[PDB]
UniProtKB/TrEMBL annotation:
It catalyses: ATP + H2O = ADP + phosphate + H(+). This is NS3 protease. Residues 23-198 form the Peptidase S29 domain. Keywords: Capsid protein, Glycoprotein, Host membrane, Host-virus interaction, Hydrolase, Membrane, Metal-binding, Protease, Transmembrane, Transmembrane helix, Viral attachment to host cell, Virion, Virus entry into host cell, Zinc. PROSITE patterns: HV_PV_NS3_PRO. It comes from Hepacivirus hominis.
């Protein structure tokens, strides 16, 4: 009944993938309990840094990537949820279920990737474990792994970036193509798809 109907919590930033120096590595900034309370209130006072955030709901964890002042992630992770912020929950400014895409204004203190204009096909996928995985672009929204690996290694990395050799954003990781549990290829939202959404 309506008196009892509950509301879903916000997406919460719980860490980041540090790409600052010569070594990529994941950092956790909030533990599970603090994530739970922050999801309910939507008020996140934590300092945000970097381009690739690790984000969580009450039931899922995945990635979100800042490009051109928008923090982008996948609809299958975030749904229509708000994101927690110092001032309370922030409503999505982009939602496209047809592309599996959502976006919020990039949180203050984040750094944004620049959209790639290179037209290169030698890409790099960044995972939630801070692995940098070479990917050859094979189409507008897909690329093959140069070194296949079980899908277990890619789970939780949707919303992460595919980058060009110069470090620009080429796309947002959306799905994995697997055979007998081995990921041979990935699908991603191309940055041009974001650039038109913007
Ligand atoms: C609800 O409204 C929606 C609108 C649009 C929408 N659009 C897509 C494409 C979608 O796809 C599902 C979620 C994807 C996923 O799991 N994303 C990764 C991930 O990590 N998620 S995640 O962070 O763990 C999680 C779940 C958020 C917390 C990156 C995957 C890593 C490992 C794969 C595990 C086995 C799964 C293999 C799948 N393969 C595949 O679907 O291949 C395609 C591509 C070509 C065309 C047809 C087939 C696969 O990847 N997904 C299945 N759901 C929706 C839902
Ligand atoms: Zn580029």
């Amino acid at each position: 009944h309506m008196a009892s109907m509950k509301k879903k919590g916000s997406v919460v930033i719980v860490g980041r993938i540090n790409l600052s120096g010569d070594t990529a590595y994941a950092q956790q900034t909030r533990g599970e309990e603090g994530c739970q309370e922050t999801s309910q209130t939507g008020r996140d006072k934590n300092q945000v840094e970097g381009e690739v955030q690790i984000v969580s709901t009450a039931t899922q964890t995945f990635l979100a990537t800042s490009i051109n002042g928008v923090l982008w992630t996948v609809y299958h992770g975030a749904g229509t949820r708000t994101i927690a912020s110092p001032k309370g929950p922030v409503t999505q400014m982009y939602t496209n279920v047809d592309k599996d895409l959502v976006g919020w204004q990039a949180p203050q203190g984040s750094r944004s990737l620049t959209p790639c204009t290179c037209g290169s096909s030698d890409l790099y996928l960044v995972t939630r474990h801070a692995d940098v995985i070479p990917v050859r672009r094979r189409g507008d929204s897909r690329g093959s792994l140069l070194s296949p690996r079980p899908i277990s290694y890619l789970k939780g990395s949707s919303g992460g970036p595919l980058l060009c050799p110069a470090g620009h954003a080429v796309g947002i990781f959306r799905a994995a193509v697997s055979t007998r549990g081995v990921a041979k290829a990935v699908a991603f939202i191309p940055v041009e798809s974001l650039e038109t959404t913007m």
